[PDB]
Design a protein around this nucleic acid. Structure first.
Ligand SMILES: [Zn+2]
Length: 199
DNA sequence: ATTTTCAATT
């Protein structure tokens, strides 16, 4: 297991794990949540020294054997840690490999946060939409009520994501021929869920 | 455009 270099900083993401996790292929994949924090200044976006970070659904705990719930809930507690103030506007984007998520408290608590902080802008990016049965359709509409901000990832974003999430020299990102077929479906799948809004 | 996928330990 070569894994990422020990002398290297944990801020860099391994290329195999990043590609394998973003590959969305059939086999074994660990759910990962990536988020970014930026400070807006009079309409001017400003980035801090380094607030990039991500969370995984895999943790350790043999003595308690207890596992954390949805990674989205854990990030919710990360909001108060930053101590965001209502006098300023901050842009927070959450990236999740899967979009579907059945739960009566996950989206419920997340929706309550948006209602409590209407000045906070939250963007949700769905790398792939296929994890829960069609029921997730109603769950998506519930979150869309307060999170009316849904966007799909594009191949161009993948190139930048690798450089931003991965910074290796001599190992360029090698895109797989699968975004074109899903890229068009992602737009069709996203509008399909919103099409129910006409009802 | 589609691909009948692992996640709590030893
Ligand atoms: Zn959830």
């Amino acid at each position: 297991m070569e894994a990422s270099p020990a002398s290297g900083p944990r801020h860099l993401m391994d290329p195999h794990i990043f590609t394998s996790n973003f590959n969305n292929g059939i086999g074994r994949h660990k759910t990962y949540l990536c988020y970014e924090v930026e400070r807006l200044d009079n309409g001017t976006s400003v980035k801090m020294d380094q607030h990039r970070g991500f969370l995984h659904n895999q943790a350790k705990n043999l003595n308690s054997g207890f596992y954390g719930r949805h990674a989205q809930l854990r990030f919710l507690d990360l909001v108060p840690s930053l101590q965001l103030d209502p006098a300023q506007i901050y842009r927070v984007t959450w990236f999740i490999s899967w979009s579907p998520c059945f739960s009566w408290g996950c989206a419920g608590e997340v929706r309550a946060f948006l209602q409590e902080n209407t000045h906070v802008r939250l963007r949700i990016f769905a790398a792939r939409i296929y994890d829960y049965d069609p029921l997730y359709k109603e769950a998506l509409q519930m979150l869309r009520d307060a999170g009316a901000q849904v966007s799909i990832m594009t191949y161009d974003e993948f190139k930048h994501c690798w450089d931003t999430f991965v910074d290796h020299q001599g190992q360029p990102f090698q895109p797989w021929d699968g975004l074109d077929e899903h890229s068009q479906a992602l737009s069709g799948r996203l509008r399909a869920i919103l099409q129910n809004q006409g009802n």
